Amino acid sequence: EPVDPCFRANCEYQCQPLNQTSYLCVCAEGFAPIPHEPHRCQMF
Numbered sequence: 744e745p746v747d748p749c750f751r752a753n754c755e756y757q758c759q760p761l762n763q764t765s766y767l768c769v770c771a772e773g774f775a776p777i778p779h780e781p782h783r784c785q786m787f
Contacts, residue, residue: 749768753782755783774787
């Protein structure tokens with residue numbers, strides 16, 4: 744999208760309404776979501 748990925752729960756790639764223990768905003772394809780944060784990543 745040309746305006747924030749999901750625009751709502753602050754994301755950086757895809758959207759997952761309640762990603763297990765989060766709130767929308769997943770990681771991506773080649774990105775390991777830090778343990779203390781899934782919507783964010785640090786590149787594998």
